[PDB]
Amino acid sequence: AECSVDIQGNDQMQFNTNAITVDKSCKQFTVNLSHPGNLPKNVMGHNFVLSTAADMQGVVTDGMASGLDKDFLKPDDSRVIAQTKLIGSGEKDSVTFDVSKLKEGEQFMFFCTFPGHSALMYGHLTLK
Numbered sequence: 001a002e003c004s005v006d007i008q009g010n011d012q013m014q015f016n017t018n019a020i021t022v023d024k025s026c027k028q029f030t031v032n033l034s035h036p037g038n039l040p041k042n043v044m045g046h047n048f049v050l051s052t053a054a055d056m057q058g059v060v061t062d063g064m065a066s067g068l069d070k071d072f073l074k075p076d077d078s079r080v081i082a083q084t085k086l087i088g089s090g091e092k093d094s095v096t097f098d099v100s101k102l103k104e105g106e107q108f109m110f111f112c113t114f115p116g117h118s119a120l121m122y123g124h125l126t127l128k
């Protein structure tokens, strides 16, 4: 766990954390998502989605439009820096992405795009 983090989305519509810190010195970064709840993907599905803070509202809105079968994410959305699959209870999914896509002057935000969830399920990711 030098260039990774483990993150859980649960039945209470929260991520375990609201802040991720990525070490400047990292080549790649991995986010390992799991769902320690009991609810299935339709009731309480979570993904881990990374964009700039300005792109977050568009990513969420177009995601909802996109529907459950597409993991509530617009296909091929260039705003998304990193994404997992949408997961339900007992599932897990990781994503690895290049630190270079963390462009030097940006503010970054992570969030779930399952409808409604981003009200609580969001945080900041900072390259440090």
Ligand SMILES: [Cu+2]
Pocket (backbone or CB within 6 Å): 009, 044, 045, 046, 047, 112, 113, 114, 117, 121
């Ligand atoms: Cu969620």
